[PDB]
Amino acid sequence: SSLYRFKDVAEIQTKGFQTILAILKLSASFSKLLVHHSFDLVIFHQMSSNIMEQKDQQFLNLCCKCFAKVAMDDYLKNVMLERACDQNNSIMVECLLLLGADANQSLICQVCEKESSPKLVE
Numbered sequence: 586s587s588l589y590r591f592k593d594v595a596e597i598q599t600k601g602f603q604t605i606l607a608i609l610k611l612s613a614s615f616s617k618l619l620v621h622h623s624f625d626l627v628i629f630h631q632m633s634s635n636i637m638e639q640k641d642q643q644f645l646n647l648c649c650k651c652f653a654k655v656a657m658d659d660y661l662k663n664v665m666l667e668r669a670c671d672q673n674n675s676i677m678v679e680c681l682l683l684l685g686a687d688a689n690q691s692l693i694c695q696v697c698e699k700e701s702s703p704k705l706v707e
Contacts, residue, residue, distance in 0.1 A: 588627040598631055602647045609654045616655040625668045628652060629677045636676075656684060663690055670695065673702045 591597040608615050616624075632648050635641065656662060666686045669678045678686075696706055 592627060592630060598627075599644055599647070601627075602631075602644070602651055606647055606651045606654070609651055613654065613657070617658065617661055619655065620661055620665060620668075623668075624655070625665055628655075629669060629672075629674050633674065633676055659685055662686060666690075667692075667695075670701070670705065671699075673705060675702060675705050678705065 588598060588601045605619070609619075628648070628651070632645075632652065635645050635648060655665075662681060662685060666678060666681045667690075669681060670692065693706075
């Protein structure tokens with residue numbers, strides 16, 4: 586809630602990724618709970634925007650660090666994929682597809698129903 590209500594400022598998002606990376610280092614089970622609290626929105630929007638903006642080294646490094654720590658337990662990767670295609674956030678579904686996912690988990694039906702983007706269908 587702190588990261589989402591402050592999804593634009595720099596110090597909050599950077600230090601928030603730092604604290605989340607710290608707790609995720611201390612406990613790996615604090616990832617399913619995180620995405621249960623809809624962790625997907627902050628990580629997707631920030632990882633999209635930081636590449637869209639000036640790509641800082643260390644900020645994006647912490648970004649992919651916590652994203653790697655949540656990338657395990659591929660059931661969570663699948664629900665992250667489902668929430669990613671629930672939006673038209675094509676880059677992140679492309680990333681999760683390169684990482685590991687399945688359109689046969691339907692998903693093509695969901696992408697055809699809700700007026701989605703052609704690059705997402707491709």
